[PDB]
C-alpha cells in the first residue's frame, strides 16, 4: 500500500496492529489526530476480503472522525478500530479481553466506542479491562438513547438550513420529505410535527410507512419516487451514495439535511448542489448528536448537559454557511476548513504553559 | 492427612490455619486457585468432630466454588473458610474483629461472604475491619434478596434445558414438578405460573404447600412420590444426595434443573442419566445466580447490572450441552471441562504487560 | 506482506507505525512477547529501499530479542524499533521529541535502548520525553562501558563451553583463535591473557593486531587463513554469516564461542556442526552481556550487581548443553526451547493473584 | 496612573495583565486581598475608550468585593476580571480557553463568577480549563436562581432595618415603596405580600408594573415621583447614583434598604442620610445573597444550607448597626469597620501552625 | 505606556504586579512565552526614577530571555522580574518571603534565578517558600561556578566562528584580542592559552592587566587602543553598546565572539558588520553557558551533563551560520529566526496528546 506515503500525506499519527492468537483477535487501530483530546472512535466488527480492504477502511474512518469531532466543538481526537472477523460466528470473550488490555496498553490515548459490528455487550467485557470506553453505564444505559439525540441534532440543523434558504427559521407550513422511517427519521417526524410542519414519508419497509400515517399523518409515498417529490427540505435518513448523477435531476427541492452517513457519493456533486443553489448542509456536522451523546458520558452522564451541548449544532450550521459564504466554497469544503481553522487555533491558543492542565480524562472535584 | 499430596493433586494453591486465644477462634480458610480474580467464598460455621472434618470440608468447597465462579462467567477465583465452633454458643465481637483483621492481611487475595452458620450481622463485624466482604451494605440489603435472583437464574437455565430438550423454549403448555416451597422455589413457582406452565409442588410443610396451591395452582403431593409423577421438567429445590440408586426408576421425566446442592449423589449416576437421555442440566451451573448477586456488590450495587449478567445462565448451560455434544461426554463432566477451559483460555490470553491493569477490586473511574 | 499471517504464526503482539510530519519521522516499533516483562530493545536508524524492508527486519529482530531476554534470565520482553531515515542526513531534536512522546504513549509497555544507527546523545533528547529509555544516566554513562561486559559474558561462556568438550574449565595451556581486534575482543584477550592461555589474534586492520601483538603476546596473522589454524577454541567476533559452505571444512577447532552476532548463516550449518562433534555454544547466550547491562540500569545503576548478573552466562550454557544432550538436538534448537520453557514455566507460575505485584518498572523500597 | 501608588494607598496585592493574540483576548484580573480565602469574582466584558478606565474599573471591584465577601461571612478574598473587547462582536472559545488556562496558572489564588458582559455559557468553557470557576453544575444550574436568594437576603435585612428604626421586626401594616419590578424585587414583593405588608410599586416598564399590580395588589405610579411618596421603608432595585444633592428632600421615608449597587452616590450624602436620621443599611451587606449563593457551590450545591447561611444578613445588618451606635459614626463607615475588623481578627486568630489546613478549596471527608 | 498594544505586538503572555505593604515590595514579573517550557529568568534589583522605565526594562528582558532559552537548546521559556527598591538601603526578609510566596502563587509557570541586584543569599529566603528558584543548592553552591562554564562556551563558539572564517577550528597561532580581565575573561584566556594561542589583553584596572601578564604571557595594552590591535579574533568582554560609529573603522579583526551583553548598539551596526565581511557570530547564543549552567541545577546538579550541554554551542553558532548563508541575511537576524523555528517547530511536534507528558519540573523516576 505504500503505508508510510499514505500517513505522511494526510499526517496520521498512529497505525497498530493487535494480534491475540489463543483468542483469534486480528485488529486494526488507526489514530489520525490527537491535537484536541484523546482519539474517540467507534470499533468495528467486519469481514474483509483481504488486510487492505479493512487498513483502507480504518484510515478513511479515521479521519472521518477526526472531522467530525472537530466540528462538533468536542475535545477529542479522531480514531477508528477495525476488528477484522465475523460478528455472527466468531467473537468470545477472550477476544475482548485481549481488545482492553490492548486498550488500556495506549493510556487513555484512544477511547473507544461501539459502532456496525459491535453491541453494547461487548464493551462491558472491555469495560472490565479498561476505563478508555463509552457507552457502558447504567446510567447511559437507561436515559442515553442515542436516537433522540441524533434526531433533536438534525431537528436544529434543518433550523440553521431554514433560516439560511428562507429567512425565519420556522418551519410552520413547510413541507419535509424524509426517506427511511427508521428511529432517527421517527423521532425527527415527531418533532416536525410538534412544530407543525407537512411531512411526507416513505422507507423500504410497508409497516414503518403505515405506523407513521397512523402516527404523524403523512402521504405514504413508494421508495423510488421519493426524489421528484415537490418540497423545500428534503432529510434523507436511509443510505449513503443517494446524491449522484441519476438522482440529481429529479430534486424540486432547494434544503438537503439528514441523517445519512456519506450523502454525497463524489464532491463533483457538491460541487453540481453547489452551482444548482441547493442549500446542503453538510454531513457529518447534522448528525453528529450521535458523538456528542456517548462523549457526554466522560463527565459523568447527565441528559441537560448533553441536550444543551446538542443543541449548539444550529450555530455549527451557522458558521459552515458562514464560512462558505465568506471564500466562496461549497459548503462540504466549508465544513473540513471549520474543523481544520478549530485545530490550528485550539493548537495555538493552549500553548502557555501549566504542570496541571485539564483535558477530558481529568479526575477533578465533585461540585 | 499428608496434606500437600492433596494439595498437590489439585493444585491448591494456601490452606491457611488462624487462631485467637483470647477470643476463641479457630478458622481455616482454603484458596483453591486465583488465576481468574480473587478467591470469593463463603465464611461458613460448624461443629466438627475433628478437624481432619474440617478441612477435607474446606477443600471440597473451595474446589467447587472455583468452578462455579469460573463457569459463572465472573473474574473470581475459589476459595472456602470454615469457622470451627457453635453458632449458637460460641459467637463474640472479638472472633470477628480478629478474623477481620486476617482477612485484611491477606490484601485482597480472598473475598468473603455468608454461608450456613453465618449471618449479615457477623458480616457486620467483619466489615468493621476489612473491605473484602461482600453482602454488607444498606443498597444490598434493600434491594439485594438472592432467592429471586437464584430462580431468575433457575429460570433461564430451564430455558435453555427446554430449549435443548424440546426444540423450543416455550414452556406454555409444560409440567414442572417441583419440591420443596422454600424462597427460590416460590419465586421459581411465580416465574413460571406467570409464564403459564402447570405447576406439581411438595415440601415437608404443609403450610407452604397450602400457600403454593392458594396461589399458584398447583396439586398437594406427598414428599415421598414426588418422583413418580408423569412430567417434563422436574426442579429439585430441596436437598442433595437425591439421584441415586433408590430413585433413579422412578422418573417418568427427562429434563432435571433445580436450585439444590449437590444433586448427584455419585458420579455414577450422571453416568446413569447420561445413559437414559434425561437431559441432566449440571447443578452448580443452574443455581449460580445468588453468587453473580453477591459479586455484583463489588462494583457498586446496582440491580439492572446484576440481573442483566443473571440472564445469561441461559447461554451457560447452552456451552455446557454444545461442549457435551462436541466431545461424547456427561454433562457434569462438561460443565468441569467448560470452567477449566475459561481458566487456560484467560491465562493465556491475558499475558501482555500492564503496569495499571484491571481487576475486580481497582478503584476506577466513577462515569 | 499479508502482515496478520506472518504476525499470527509467530504470535507477535503488536506492530506500531509511528509518523510525524513536521519533523520527518517514520518509525516501526514491533512488540512480540510481553509475558516476562516489558518489551526492551534498541532504536536501529538505518536507510531502506522500501518499507518491507524494514518491517521484515524489525519483525526479525522482535523475535530475535524474544529469546535473547528469556535466555539471559531477564524479567523482560523482546521488542525492536526501526526509524527509517539517513543517520548521516536526516536526524535533528524533533523527531526524537516525537518519538519519545510515542514512547510514553505506550506507557511502559516498551522500553528503548540504542543500537546501529543511534547513539547516546539521541537517547538523551527521547529521555526528556519519556523514562522508558536506557542508557541515559551519568552513573552508567561513567562506570558502564558495555564492551567490559560483554568480553567479561564471552569468558564465562567459554569457561562453560570449555567445562563441556574438555571436563575441565581451565584454559591454562590452550589455543584460542579470535578474530577481529575489537574493543570486546580486546577485553576478551586481555581476560585470556591474565588467566594464561595462549592467543592467536587477527583483524582487518593492521594497526589493532600489531596493538595485540605488542600487548598480549599473539601471532599476527592474516585474515582469510584464521579459519584453518590449528587450535581448540575458536572465538569469532567480527561479523554475521561465518559459518556457512565455503568455511566448514577449514575448522581444525572443536569449541565455537564468540561475540558475533548471527554466526551460523543458516541452521543446516548448525546441523552439519551437530553432525561434526564441535561444540557450539549458541550466540545470543554468550554475547548476551551487554543487553544484562544495560538491563541493569533499570533498578539504578551498580556495577557490582550488574557483574554478579552477568556471571550466570556460565550456568547459561550449561542449562543449553543439558538441554541438548536431554532431547539429543542441536545447540541452536535447545537454546531456543531453554527459551520457551522459561518463558511459559513463568507464565504458568506467576498466575496466582495479587493487587500490588512488583516488576521491572515498579517504585519500591530505597534500603 | 503611577500604579504602585495607587497599589500601596489601598494594599492591593496583585494586578495581572493577560493578553493572547490569536484569540484576541485582553484581559485585567485584580487581586486586593486574599487574607481570609481564595479571590472570588466577577468576569466582566465590557468596552472601554482606554486601558485605564478598564484598569481603574477592576481596582474599584476588586476592593469592593474584598469588602462584600468579608461582611458576608465568607472565607473568600476579593479579586475582579474585566475583559476588554466587545460582548457582542468579539467572543469565542479561543479567548475562553486562553482565559481559563491563566486563571488555572493561578492555582486556585483567583475564582471566577459571572457579571455584566458574560453569561453562563462562557463559564462552560473556561470550565473546560479549570476547575476554578463557580455558576457551572447541573445542580446550581437547576436549583441555583440567583434572584430568589438576593430577594431572601434583601427580606432579612429589611427585617433588621425595621427592628432597629420601629422596635420590631414584624412589617404587618407597613408601606414599602419599590422602584423597578425586575426578578429580584418582584421575588421581594412576593415575601413581603406573604408576609402581608402594603406594596407600593413602579418600573420604567408598563407591563412589569401591571403584573405587579394584578399579582400583588400595589399603586401602579409614575417613575419620577416614587421618591415623594409617603412610606416607612424605601427599597431601590434599579439603577446606582440614586441618592444625590436632587433627590434628598423627597424622601418623607426614614428605612432605606434594597438591592441597588452603589446606592449612595457620593459620601457626603451618606452623611447627610445619618444628619437627617433616616436609617440607611448600607448597599453591599443587604444584596450579599447572590455572592453567598454562588460560594455555596464550592461545596458541593445544596439549597438548605444555602439559605441557611443567607438567613444571617439580619445579624450582619444588626452588627453594622451596632458598631455605627458604637463609635457614632455613619453606617456605610459602620460596614467597612464590621468588613476590616473582621479580616484584622481572622489573621491574627488562625495563626496557630497546622500542617494539614482546611480552605474553601480542599478535598475532605464526603460525610 | 498604552500596554495591552506593546504586549500584542510582541505576544506577551502575562505582565504581573506584585505589591506588598508591610516589607515594601514592589515587583514586575514578565513572563513573554512559556511554549518550550517553564519562563526561567533572572530576579533583577534596580532604582528606577519611575515606573515605566522599570517596565520596559522588563519587558525587554522577558523577550531577550526567550530568544536566549530557545537558541540555547533548553526546554524553558523567558521572563524576567524587575523589584523596584536599592540593593544597599531597601532589602529584608520579609520582601523576599512575600515574593517568593507570590512566585509559589504561579505554580512552577515562572522560575526564578540571581541576575543584577541580588546575591545568593536572597535566592535562599525565596527558597524558603518556593521550589521554583535555581541557584541556591550546596551542590551548585560547590561545583556551579557560573564563569568557568560561560568561558568554556564563549571557546566553544569562537572554535565555531573560527572554523566559519578560516576553514579548521585550530586556533594554535591566532591573536585573540580580550577587553576585560574579569573572571569570564580570565578563564578563557587560560583555556586559549592551554590551546596555545597568542593572547593580546586588556582592562580598566592596571592590577588584572599585571595578572595576566604574569601568568599567560600577554600584552599589557591601554582600554583606549585595543580596537586597533592587528588581530584574526577580538572578544569583547566588559560592556555593551561597543560596535558604533565611533569604534568601526578601527577594527584590523574579523572575528567577533566574547562574552558581553548587548554587543551590538544598534542593528545598523550589524548590518554593518555584515557588509565588511567581518564574522560576528551573535552574543546571546556565545555566552549561554551561564543559563545553561543554572538551568542544569533542576535536573539535580551535575557537573559532566552540564558540560556535556555546554559543549554544544559550537553546533549552536554552526546552524546559526548556516542560516545566515541559506537566506543572506545578517547573523543577528540568524539567530532569531534560528529561535523562532525552534519555537513553532516544538509546538507543532510535540503536539500529541498524552495524560502523563514530562515536562523540566516532572518528579520522575531516579535512575
Same mark, same amino acid.
Given at each position: 500500500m505504500e503505508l508510510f506515503q499514505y500517513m505522511e500525506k494526510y499526517d496520521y499519527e498512529q497505525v497498530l496492529f493487535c494480534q491475540d492468537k489463543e483468542s483469534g483477535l486480528k485488529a486494526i487501530i488507526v489514530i489520525h489526530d490527537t491535537t484536541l483530546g484523546p482519539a474517540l472512535g467507534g470499533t468495528r466488527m467486519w469481514m474483509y476480503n483481504s488486510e487492505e480492504e479493512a487498513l483502507e477502511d480504518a484510515l478513511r474512518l479515521a479521519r472521518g472522525m477526526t472531522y467530525k469531532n472537530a466540528a462538533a466543538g468536542l475535545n477529542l481526537g479522531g480514531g477508528k478500530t477495525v476488528i477484522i472477523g465475523d460478528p455472527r460466528k466468531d467473537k468470545n470473550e477472550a477476544m475482548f479481553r485481549a481488545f482492553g488490555r490492548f486498550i488500556q496498553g495506549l493510556n487513555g490515548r484512544y477511547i473507544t466506542a461501539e459502532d456496525v459490528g459491535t453491541t453494547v455487550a461487548d464493551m462491558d467485557i472491555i469495560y472490565q479491562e479498561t476505563d478508555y470506553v463509552t457507552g457502558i453505564s447504567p446510567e447511559f444505559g437507561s436515559s442515553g438513547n442515542p436516537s433522540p439525540a441524533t434526531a433533536y441534532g438534525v431537528y436544529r440543523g434543518m433550523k440553521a438550513a431554514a433560516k439560511e434558504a428562507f429567512g425565519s427559521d420556522s418551519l410552520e407550513g413547510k413541507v419535509v420529505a424524509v426517506q427511511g422511517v427508521g428511529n432517527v427519521a421517527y423521532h425527527l417526524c415527531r418533532h416536525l410535527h410538534e412544530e407543525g410542519a407537512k411531512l411526507i414519508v416513505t422507507d423500504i419497509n410497508k409497516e414503518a410507512v403505515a405506523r407513521a400515517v397512523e402516527?404523524? %399523518?403523512?402521504?405514504?409515498? +413508494?421508495?423510488?419516487?421519493?426524489?421528484?417529490?415537490?418540497?423545500? *427540505?428534503?432529510?434523507?435518513?436511509?443510505? %449513503?451514495?443517494?446524491?449522484? +448523477?441519476?438522482?440529481?435531476?429529479?430534486?424540486?427541492?432547494?434544503? *438537503?439535511?439528514?441523517?445519512a452517513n456519506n450523502q454525497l457519493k463524489e464532491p463533483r456533486h457538491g460541487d453540481m448542489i453547489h452551482e444548482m443553489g441547493i442549500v446542503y448542509a453538510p454531513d457529518y456536522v447534522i448528525n453528529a448528536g450521535g458523538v456528542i451523546n456517548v462523549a457526554d458520558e466522560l463527565y459523568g452522564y447527565n441528559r441537560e448537559r448533553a441536550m444543551k451541548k446538542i443543541e449548539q449544532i444550529y450555530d455549527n450550521i451557522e458558521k459552515v454557511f458562514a464560512i462558505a459564504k465568506r471564500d466562496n466554497i461549497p459548503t462540504y469544503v466549508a465544513a473540513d476548513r471549520m474543523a481544520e481553522e478549530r485545530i490550528e487555533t485550539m493548537r495555538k491558543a493552549r500553548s502557555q504553559f501549566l504542570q496541571n492542565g485539564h483535558h477530558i480524562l481529568s479526575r477533578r472535584r465533585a461540585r
Amino acid at each position: 500500500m505504500e503505508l508510510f506515503q499514505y500517513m505522511e500525506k494526510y499526517d496520521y499519527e498512529q497505525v497498530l496492529f493487535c494480534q491475540d492468537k489463543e483468542s483469534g483477535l486480528k485488529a486494526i487501530i488507526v489514530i489520525h489526530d490527537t491535537t484536541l483530546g484523546p482519539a474517540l472512535g467507534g470499533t468495528r466488527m467486519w469481514m474483509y476480503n483481504s488486510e487492505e480492504e479493512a487498513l483502507e477502511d480504518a484510515l478513511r474512518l479515521a479521519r472521518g472522525m477526526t472531522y467530525k469531532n472537530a466540528a462538533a466543538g468536542l475535545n477529542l481526537g479522531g480514531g477508528k478500530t477495525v476488528i477484522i472477523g465475523d460478528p455472527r460466528k466468531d467473537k468470545n470473550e477472550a477476544m475482548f479481553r485481549a481488545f482492553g488490555r490492548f486498550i488500556q496498553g495506549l493510556n487513555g490515548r484512544y477511547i473507544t466506542a461501539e459502532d456496525v459490528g459491535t453491541t453494547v455487550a461487548d464493551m462491558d467485557i472491555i469495560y472490565q479491562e479498561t476505563d478508555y470506553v463509552t457507552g457502558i453505564s447504567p446510567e447511559f444505559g437507561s436515559s442515553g438513547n442515542p436516537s433522540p439525540a441524533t434526531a433533536y441534532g438534525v431537528y436544529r440543523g434543518m433550523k440553521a438550513a431554514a433560516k439560511e434558504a428562507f429567512g425565519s427559521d420556522s418551519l410552520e407550513g413547510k413541507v419535509v420529505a424524509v426517506q427511511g422511517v427508521g428511529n432517527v427519521a421517527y423521532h425527527l417526524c415527531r418533532h416536525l410535527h410538534e412544530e407543525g410542519a407537512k411531512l411526507i414519508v416513505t422507507d423500504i419497509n410497508k409497516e414503518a410507512v403505515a405506523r407513521a400515517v397512523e402516527e404523524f %399523518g403523512a402521504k405514504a409515498v +413508494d421508495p423510488n419516487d421519493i426524489y421528484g417529490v415537490e418540497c423545500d *427540505i428534503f432529510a434523507p435518513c436511509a443510505l %449513503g451514495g443517494i446524491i449522484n +448523477d441519476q438522482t440529481i435531476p429529479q430534486l424540486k427541492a432547494k434544503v *438537503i439535511a439528514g441523517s445519512a452517513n456519506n450523502q454525497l457519493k463524489e464532491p463533483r456533486h457538491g460541487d453540481m448542489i453547489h452551482e444548482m443553489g441547493i442549500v446542503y448542509a453538510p454531513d457529518y456536522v447534522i448528525n453528529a448528536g450521535g458523538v456528542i451523546n456517548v462523549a457526554d458520558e466522560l463527565y459523568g452522564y447527565n441528559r441537560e448537559r448533553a441536550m444543551k451541548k446538542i443543541e449548539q449544532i444550529y450555530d455549527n450550521i451557522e458558521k459552515v454557511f458562514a464560512i462558505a459564504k465568506r471564500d466562496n466554497i461549497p459548503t462540504y469544503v466549508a465544513a473540513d476548513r471549520m474543523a481544520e481553522e478549530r485545530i490550528e487555533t485550539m493548537r495555538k491558543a493552549r500553548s502557555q504553559f501549566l504542570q496541571n492542565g485539564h483535558h477530558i480524562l481529568s479526575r477533578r472535584r465533585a461540585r
